[PDB]
Design brief:
six-stranded antiparallel sheet; 287 residues; Jelly Rolls; mainly beta; globular; seven-stranded antiparallel sheet; part of a larger assembly; Fab; binds a molecule of 3 linked components (NAG-NAG-BMA); 2 helices; spike; binds a molecule of 2 linked components (NAG-NAG); 4% helix; 4 chains; viral protein/immune system; SARS-CoV-2; binds 2-acetamido-2-deoxy-beta-D-glucopyranose
Chain lengths: 287, 98, 49, 69
C-alpha cells in the first residue's frame, strides 16, 4: 500500500537519562578482575537522550554519525526493523533490517523506498517499505532479535562492517529506561563497505523509541570472571568519574588527585603585517 | 542487432555451443568477502608451537584452560593484554597459552 | 546452471560473503578450456577478494 | 601567557559520599555559585570558612578541605 501516514506527531524530544545503559562489548578479548579502559563510541552516561514515540505513526530520520543506540517497547503489535543509508532518497545503496518472529533479514541493496516506509502486516511485508530493489550487495539471514523486556541495540559502521549488538532488559517505566549497567553482545558483522549518514526507525503498522547518538568517549570497563562487563565509568563525565578513570579504579580513596590541565582559549585572532599591493614579479621570471 | 546462433546437433565442433563462465576477482580498498577454504594442521598439545588461529598468531604451548569465554570472545588476554588463552575455531575449546 | 545467457546479454552473478575451493574446478578435468590470468591456476586458495 | 594550570579533584572515599570539588591551579573562578577563590587556585563545588580546623584533604598555601553539614 505504501501509505504516507503523514501524522507529524511532533512530540517534544522528551529526553531522559541514559543512566549507565549504552555499553556493549568492544572486542573479542576475555578479561577477568581487571578494569580495562577503552575509547570507542557509546552513549555518555547520564546524557539526556530522546524518547520519541510513533504512538498515527511517524518514521523520523536522525544523523547516524559514527553509530547510534536504539531501544524500544511495543504492545501486542510488535515493531521490528530499521533503515540506514547515506541519503535514503533511492540514489545509493542502503541497509534495511526487517526482523520477524523466526529470523531476521539484514540486507544491503538499492531500495526504491516509499514516502513513509512501513512493514505491512502473520509476518512483515517489505513491499510496504519500498516498492522495488536492485544493485544488491548482500542479504544476511540469522536469528530474530526478540526475547516488558526492552530490546536494546547498538548500530555501528566500522571499517566497512555493519555491527549490530543486542540485549533484553525488564521495564519498570514504559517511557523511560531500566536503570542498571548494560553490556550488549554483537550478533551481526557485515563486510559491506558502505557509509551511513542517516538513520530512520522502521515501523510496522499496527510504539515508543529511545534513540541516542553515540559519542567517542572513554569508558572504564570492569570485567568479571565470566568475561563480562559488570560495571563502568564514563571518563570525564564529571570530576569523580575523572578521578576513577585517571586512577584506573571503580573506587577512589579519600584525597586529592590530579586528573587534568585547564587552559584558557583565545577569544580573538589578530593578524598584523606590512601593506604591499605589488603582486610579486616571480610571474615575470616565467613570462 | 542480435543474431541467433544456429546451434544444430549436426554442427562440427567449432560450431557447437560452449558454456563459458568467467570468474573475475576484484580487490578494492574494502573488506574482502570471497575467500578460499583456508588451511589447518593438527592440534598439538603440550609442545612448543608456532600458532595461527584464524589470524591470531604467536608462539607457546597449549593446555586446557579452567575458564569460560563469552560467545563473542575467541581469545583472552592477561594484565598487559598479551595472549592468555585461545579458542580453537574447528573445535571450540579454550586452551591456555604457556 | 540449467540455462545460460546469450553472449550479447551475458549474466552476472555477484558473489560476496562466501568461501570457495577453486582447485575443484581443475581437479575435475571437466572443462575443455581453463586459463587463469593475474592469479596463478595452481590452487590459489590463499587469496580473498 | 593565557591562564592555565593543573586540575585536581577533592574527593571523600567513594564508599562514604560522592561530593567532590575541583581545584584549578593558579586561575580565576570565572575562567575554570559554590566557588572558592584562593591562592592555590579556585575550588569549584566548594564553600569556605575563615576559622581554623584540622587538615583533611589539602588545597595548598595553608588551606585544607573537609566535609561538614
Ligand atoms: C567442525 O566440524 C567438525 C567436523 O569434523 C566437527 O567435529 C566433529 O564433532 C562431533 C561432535 O563432537 C563428533 O561427533 C562425535 O564425536 C564424539 C567424540 O569426538 C564421538 O564419540 C561420537 O561417536 C561422534 O563421532 C565428530 O566425530 C567430530 N568430527 C571429527 C573429530 O572429525 C567440529 O565439532 C566442528 N566444530 C565447530 C566449532 O563447529
Ligand atoms: C522470517 O524471515 C526469514 C528470512 O527471510 C524467513 O525464512 C524464509 O522463509 C521463506 C518463506 O517463509 C522461504 O522462502 C525462504 O527460503 C526462507 N529463507 C531462509 C534464509 O531460510 C522466515 O520464514 C520468516 N519468518 C516467517 C514467520 O515467515
Ligand atoms: C550500482 O552499483 C555500482 C557498483 O556496485 C555503482 O557504481 C553504481 O553507482 C550503483 N548505482 C546505483 C543507482 O546505486
Ligand atoms: C562467573 O564466574 C564465577 C566463577 O566461576 C561463577 O561462580 C559464576 O556463576 C559465573 N557467573 C555467571 C556464569 O553468570
Ligand atoms: C606569466 O607567468 C604567470 C605565472 O607563471 C602566468 O600565470 C601567466 O600566464 C604568464 N603570462 C603570460 C605567459 O603571458
Ligand atoms: C584573576 O585574578 C587575578 C588576581 O587578582 C587578576 O590579576 C586577573 O585580572 C584575574 N583574571 C581575570 C579576571 O580574567
Ligand atoms: C567567613 O566566611 C563566611 C562564609 O564564606 C562569610 O560569610 C564571612 O563573611 C567570612 N568572615 C570573615 C570575617 O571574613
Amino acid at each position: 500500500q505504501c501509505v504516507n501516514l503523514t501524522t507529524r506527531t511532533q512530540l517534544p524530544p522528551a529526553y531522559t537519562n541514559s543512566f549507565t545503559r549504552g555499553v556493549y562489548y568492544p572486542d573479542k578479548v576475555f578479561r577477568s578482575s581487571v578494569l580495562h579502559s577503552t575509547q570507542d563510541l557509546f552513549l555518555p552516561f547520564f546524557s539526556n537522550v530522546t524518547w520519541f514515540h510513533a504512538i498515527r505513526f511517524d518514521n523520523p530520520v536522525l544523523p547516524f554519525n559514527d553509530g547510534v543506540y536504539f531501544a524500544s517497547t511495543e504492545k501486542s503489535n510488535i515493531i521490528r526493523g530499521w533503515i540506514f543509508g547515506t541519503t535514503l532518497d533511492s540514489k545509493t545503496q542502503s541497509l534495511l533490517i526487517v526482523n520477524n518472529a523466526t529470523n531476521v533479514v539484514i540486507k544491503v541493496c538499492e531500495f526504491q523506498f516509499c514516502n513513509d516506509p512501513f512493514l505491512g502486516v502473520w509476518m512483515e511485508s517489505e513491499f510496504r517499505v519500498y516498492s522495488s530493489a536492485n544493485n544488491c550487495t548482500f542479504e544476511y539471514v540469522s536469528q530474530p532479535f526478540l526475547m516488558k523486556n526492552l530490546r536494546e541495540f547498538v548500530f555501528k559502521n566500522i571499517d566497512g562492517y555493519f555491527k549490530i549488538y543486542s540485549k533484553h532488559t525488564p521495564i519498570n517505566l514504559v517511557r523511560d529506561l531500566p536503570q542498571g549497567f548494560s553490556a550488549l553482545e554483537p550478533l551481526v558483522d557485515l563486510p559491506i563497505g558502505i557509509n551511513i549518514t542517516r538513520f530512520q526507525t522502521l515501523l510496522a503498522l499496527h510504539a515508543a523509541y529511545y534513540v541516542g547518538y553515540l559519542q567517542p568517549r572513554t569508558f572504564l570497563l570492569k570485567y568479571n570472571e565470566n568475561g563480562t562487563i559488570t560495571d563502568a565509568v564514563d571518563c570525564a563525565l564529571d570530576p569523580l568519574s575523572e578521578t576513577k578513570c585517571t586512577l584506573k579504579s571503580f573506587t577512589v580513596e579519600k584525597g586529592i588527585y590530579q586528573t587534568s590541565n585547564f587552559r584558557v582559549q583565545p577569544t580573538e585572532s589578530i593578524v598584523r603585517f606590512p601593506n604591499i599591493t605589488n603582486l610579486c614579479p616571480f610571474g615575470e621570471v616565467f613570462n | 542487432p542480435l543474431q541467433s546462433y544456429g546451434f544444430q546437433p549436426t554442427n562440427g565442433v567449432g560450431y557447437q555451443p560452449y558454456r563459458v563462465v568467467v570468474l573475475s576477482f576484484e580487490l578494492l580498498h574494502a573488506p574482502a568477502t570471497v575467500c578460499g577454504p583456508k588451511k589447518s594442521t593438527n592440534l598439538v598439545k603440550n609442545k612448543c608451537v608456532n600458532f595461527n588461529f584464524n589470524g591470531l598468531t604467536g608462539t607457546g604451548v597449549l593446555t586446557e584452560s579452567n575458564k569460560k569465554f563469552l560467545p563473542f570472545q575467541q581469545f583472552g588476554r592477561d594484565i598487559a593484554d598479551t595472549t592468555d588463552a585461545v579458542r580453537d575455531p574447528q573445535t571450540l575449546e579454550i586452551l591456555d597459552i604457556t | 546452471a540449467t540455462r545460460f545467457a546469450s553472449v550479447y546479454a551475458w549474466n552476472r552473478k555477484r558473489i560476496s560473503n562466501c568461501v570457495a575451493d577453486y582447485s575443484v574446478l581443475y581437479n575435475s578435468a571437466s572443462f575443455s578450456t581453463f586459463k587463469c590470468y593475474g592469479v596463478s591456476p595452481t590452487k590459489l586458495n590463499d587469496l580473498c577478494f | 601567557p593565557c591562564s592555565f594550570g593543573g586540575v585536581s579533584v577533592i574527593t571523600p572515599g567513594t564508599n562514604t559520599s560522592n561530593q567532590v570539588a575541583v581545584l584549578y591551579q593558579d586561575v580565576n573562578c570565572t575562567e575554570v555559585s559554590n566557588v572558592f577563590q584562593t591562592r592555590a587556585g579556585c575550588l569549584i563545588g566548594a564553600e569556605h570558612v575563615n576559622n581554623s580546623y584540622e587538615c583533611d584533604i589539602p588545597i595548598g598555601a595553608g588551606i585544607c578541605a573537609s566535609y561538614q553539614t
